[PDB]
Amino acid sequence: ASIIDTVANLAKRRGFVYQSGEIYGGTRSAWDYGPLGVELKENIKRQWWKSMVTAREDVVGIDTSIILPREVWVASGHVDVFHDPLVECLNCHRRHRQDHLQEVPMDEVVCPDCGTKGRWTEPREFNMMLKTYLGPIESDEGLHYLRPETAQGIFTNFANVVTTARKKPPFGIAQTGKSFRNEITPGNFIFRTREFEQMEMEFFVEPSTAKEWHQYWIDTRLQWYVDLGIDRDNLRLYEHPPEKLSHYAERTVDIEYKYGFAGDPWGELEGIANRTDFDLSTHSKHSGVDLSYYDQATDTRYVPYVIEPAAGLTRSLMAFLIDAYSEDEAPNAKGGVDKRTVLRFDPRLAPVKVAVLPLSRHADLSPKARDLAAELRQHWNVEFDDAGAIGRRYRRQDEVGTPYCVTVDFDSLEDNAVTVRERDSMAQERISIDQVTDYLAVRLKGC
Amino acid sequence: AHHHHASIIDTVANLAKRRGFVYQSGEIYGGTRSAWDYGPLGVELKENIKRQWWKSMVTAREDVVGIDTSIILPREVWVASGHVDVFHDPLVECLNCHRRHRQVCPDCGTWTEPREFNMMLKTYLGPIESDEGLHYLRPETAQGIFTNFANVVTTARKKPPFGIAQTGKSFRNEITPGNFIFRTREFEQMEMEFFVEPSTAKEWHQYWIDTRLQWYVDLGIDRDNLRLYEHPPEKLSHYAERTVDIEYKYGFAGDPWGELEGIANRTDFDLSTHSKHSGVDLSYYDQATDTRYVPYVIEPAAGLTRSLMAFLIDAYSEDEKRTVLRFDPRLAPVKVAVLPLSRHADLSPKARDLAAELRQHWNVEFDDAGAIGRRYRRQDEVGTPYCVTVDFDSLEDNAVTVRERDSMAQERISIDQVTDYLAVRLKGC
Ligand SMILES: NCC(=O)NS(=O)(=O)OC[C@H]1O[C@@H](n2cnc3c(N)ncnc32)[C@H](O)[C@@H]1O
Ligand SMILES: NCC(=O)NS(=O)(=O)OC[C@H]1O[C@@H](n2cnc3c(N)ncnc32)[C@H](O)[C@@H]1O
Ligand SMILES: [Mg+2]
Ligand SMILES: [Mg+2]
Ligand SMILES: [Zn+2]
Ligand SMILES: [Zn+2]
């Protein structure tokens, strides 16, 4: 079986993900994140926010609405150009992406729903934004779009943020949140969904420096993934050819990750575009509000250029999950060797930081173990598990990437210490209970 | 006085706009109070409230686990939940300005027959523009939890009594906006469904009412500005047998009180209807007693943006004159401000190095504009708990002055001890 299938099966079995509304018929275009998945996702997001906003003098945060005034998407150009060609099978009348079927221009292709082949309608352009209606009347007055990107909420607040945060280019505005696209086909696993969270930052610079700032952010974003544990050899850069450039972008470089898809194993992870002055210029023109920047140090006025790192939170989750997956040979209690599944997460991403495992269900072990679990829950997400053989419980934690297991044994009742097991090496060290929190805090690398 | 121990909402809203806690969404095209963006300070305050809720509900409790579910679920979910049929309110259209309102027109001064209008927002998925593609944006986050109840029982190995908690965006086609950010069409909720053996539900209901009240108090809200309001039967939602709201004294004109959080006993309504409509059994089998039952549900359902409005209003204060947001340090959006006495080659690099050290842990502001007293007032006004001054003596004793927001008391602390000094006082990161 393929690596992606193996990882997807683990994720489903341990509740990283569940298909949304599965009891009614789920698809891979919409996914829920279970108890382990919601923590992993939140940890990735928190590390992005820390790297982008908390740690940087020159980047501030914002959170804008999914549903903006419709005029925003007229001005941005999305109403006019955010569409893709659809063809309709002449036998089963299902519609498909013409470009995708052409895998470029061909002519007579096969239908992946009935197989008829050759019988297609002429192409029709299909706008990829999702629609809704606000107010009691479902009319054009009430028509709104769910945002296909978070970026326009940032651009429309550029002058507000310059004023309230007292920022001057070069500086950035960063944001996380849900975006929506009427994707015609789902992807492998969670790769391509109609609803997905993005992590986007618009970095406003003086125009003559934009190309240098573009390279800075390409290299900085690449290094962000590596610093959080992704193997650099599973990352690469991809330059958009001119025909693949979005309407707002003069140059775009994708970070791609080696997901392991059948055929071509590489996929887009994050896009880093130079959007020049397109977005502030068009909103200035359409709104009548001046979004240019006045540099008092030179008495000059200019429309900033924009460098945009635009990451996908759920695509990132998929990459971190796949990259952490590993099998190694581990001794078992019997004296033999097992194949052991381990998610080798960076400790800042792992959904459960520590597992508290009494050696057995013995009544004398539970008090100290329960008291210790309660102490650690003040700081971290913790799992308590007393069911079954200790060795099996260690492997249950290894399988979801837990960095440390703490075992309470009968000697603990006399020396008031516990055994701390490290996930990757499986090495154990005996630590006094009153120092366990500090012992873990240093190794978990939190804030 | 707002703490008995121009209205306050206008004053707080003006401050929040001036300092960028909020901006009306799409303002440059015409904003309204039904949609709001959160600026650099607002996004941090919002995230801090959310993270304290998650910590109290999920991280700190053995018996509660988390989930995050899609805004857009299969349409069949909202048929089964009853929302398609009953999530509607009476609308009265004016006969002079033809504007519809929630059943004296506040648009022309002076009426149509009431017509029931469903409050869920619709969207259309897939390539067929027609009602085959019709979906609803979720009006509550709870149905994502109920539809996964059996899934979570299996993978998390939980047994009633236990909860599943979630935060996320919900959508309602509210007809008129509220004061400030009180009632928007798009808002974030923080909801937990607590699943229990039916005979215990009324005791668990009271437990969660008291626990949720205490959560606001522990995070700094004046208990005198919170109260409990029981829904009468006519006001109960279709899924609820009993509902108690926590209300906050927002300070509106007329009646100053408003709903903050709803705590409902949803009995077995939700798991029973999805079991029936889906054909998947969402009952719980108790092996200890060889008994199978549909859990009752107790539901604390908080509003993140309504909570932000309450924490912001409650923190507002004027003393000696000085404007101060008296935030609990865990909620304050900027934890520390670093202030070089003068912007200068000998002090500024030391101040910057300290700001960078602290930004490893906390959101920090560096400010070198204007006199020090002015910079203290700028920080007090947005609730920053501590200000650290780097001055010329710092270059000799390698210590800085640390000012506490509320007392304005100052203490001189060595730089290699400042982080730990601040950590025990900020109580979170
Ligand atoms: N503002 C600039 C921009 O939007 N750029 S981008 O169009 O490239 O989307 C930015 C990122 O969002 C993620 N992403 C995009 N679409 C999807 C989807 N359907 N499912 C999952 N992740 C997605 C993906 O990781 C992508 O790199
Ligand atoms: N699941 C059970 C439930 O939903 N119950 S509830 O209907 O009460 O919504 C839960 C909470 O969401 C918040 N809330 C509700 N509607 C809005 C709105 N339009 N704007 C802002 N906040 C709102 C508010 O704080 C409310 O107490
Ligand atoms: Mg910053
Ligand atoms: Mg928990
Ligand atoms: Zn066909
Ligand atoms: Zn009227």
Author numbering:
A (entry chain B): 2 to 104, 118 to 461
B (entry chain A): -19 to -15, 2 to 99, 124 to 130, 134 to 343, 353 to 461
Which sentences did the original study use to describe this structure?
Glycyl tRNA synthetases (GlyRSs) are prospective drug targets for combating Mycobacterium tuberculosis (Mtb) and cancer in humans. Structures of all three forms – complete, or in some cases partial – have now been determined using X-ray diffraction or cryo-EM. Both Mycobacterial and human cells express the α2 subtype, and notably, the GlyRS gene in humans encodes one product that serves both the cytosol and mitochondria, which has obvious advantages for the design of selective inhibitors. Similar to the TtGlyRS, the two Mycobacterial GlyRS subunits adopt the canonical architecture consisting of an N-terminal catalytic domain and a C-terminal anticodon binding domain connected by a β-hairpin insertion. The catalytic core contains the class-II specific antiparallel β-sheet having the characteristic insertion domain after the first strand of the core β-sheet, and the anticodon recognition domain adopts the HGPT fold also found in HisRS, ProRS, and ThrRS.
In the present study, high-resolution crystal structures of MtbGlyRS and MtrGlyRS bound to glycyl-AMS were determined by X-ray diffraction to resolutions of 2.25 and 1.95 Å, respectively. The two groups of synthetases utilize different insertion domains, with the group containing MtrGlyRS having a zinc binding motif. A few of the modelled MtrGlyRS chains are more complete, however, owing to the presence and stability of the zinc binding site. The ATP binding loop orders over the adenine moiety, with conserved Phe205 docking at Arg329, Glu197 and Thr207 at the adenine N6 amine, and Arg195 at the glycyl-sulfamoyl group. This conformational state introduces stabilizing interactions with the YxG loop, including electrostatic contacts between Gly201 and Arg29 and hydrophobic packing between Phe203 and Ile204 and Trp32. The insertion domain also becomes increasingly ordered upon binding AMP and glycyl-AMS, as the lid structure becomes more organized. The two-stranded beta stem forming the base of the zinc motif head places Phe83 at the tRNA A76 binding site, where it packs between His79, Met142, Pro162, and Arg195. On the basis of the structure of tRNA-bound human GlyRS, a major conformational change must occur in this region to allow A76 to insert between and stack face-to-face with Phe83 and Arg195. Interestingly, the theoretical dissociation free energies estimated for the glycyl-AMS-bound states exceed 24 kcal/mol whereas the value for the apoenzyme model having more missing structural elements is less than 1 kcal/mole. AMP orders two tRNA recognition loops and a section of the insertion domain, and glycyl-AMS further stabilizes the structure, including the closure of a lid motif.
